[PDB]
């Protein structure tokens, strides 16, 4: 069966920090870019949508902007992985990535986000 | 693109009665089965996967156990309908259903329980 797996359903990373959260599929060939298909999102809001090579962006979501990408480099070694940079405090949360190629399954990533007392009370207010 | 869709995007159930939520994929012709990928999930909770035309059952959640059938005659349709028996208190939530046959698409469904005071007292008193 088609199946992505996920080497760690959770990361715990700090305030400010950048992170690469993995998402594994089978890539036993060339890759077939046309055949796949990634979502990645975060509670319901969308981070990046992948379909014919090409990364959509009109759907990703305000707080993503400029601050979300796929490494596409990974894709064809069967790792979609996204990377967050400057890690807020309200980017932690459950994270879902979806592939589709050649079959289809999804898995669940729960990040915490540990914040020095300063940016925890500016996200208070 | 290939878009799921749901006719109904809020279903109003009683407790203990049956339903049947509604999730069209396009479907031109004669299916191919061995391409249709069907997850219907709830808050995070599986509760169907169909895979190589056959359920699979192996990571449904315990609540859901023998309450929950895929409609398999109106795939052929177009209509992954996700039917619930003996609806329950804690079957309110947000569903999803997700979709791959050549494309990719999901939607969500949002689903309240109205119950009588009893039942509602021994759902407060779990
Ligand atoms: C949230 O909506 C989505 C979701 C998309 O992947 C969702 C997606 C991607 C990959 C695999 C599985 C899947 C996983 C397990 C079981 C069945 C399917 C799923 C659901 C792609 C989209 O775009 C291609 C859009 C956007 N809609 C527009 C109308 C469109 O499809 O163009």
Redesign the pocket.
């Known amino acids: 069966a088609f199946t992505v797996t996920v080497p760690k359903d959770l990361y715990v990373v700090e305030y400010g920090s950048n992170m690469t959260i993995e998402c594994k599929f089978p890539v036993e060939k060339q890759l077939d870019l046309a055949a796949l298909?990634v979502?990645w999102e975060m509670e319901d809001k969308?981070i990046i949508?992948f379909?014919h090579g090409e990364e959509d962006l009109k759907?990703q979501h305000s707080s993503y902007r400029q601050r979300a990408r796929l490494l596409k480099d990974q894709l064809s070694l069967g790792n979609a992985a996204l990377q967050i940079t400057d890690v807020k405090l309200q980017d932690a949360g459950v994270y879902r990535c979806?592939?589709?190629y050649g079959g289809?399954?999804?898995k669940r990533i729960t990040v915490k986000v540990n914040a020095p007392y300063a940016a925890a009370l500016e996200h208070h207010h």
């Open positions: 298909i979502y969308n949508q379909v759907t979806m592939i589709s289809a399954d999804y």
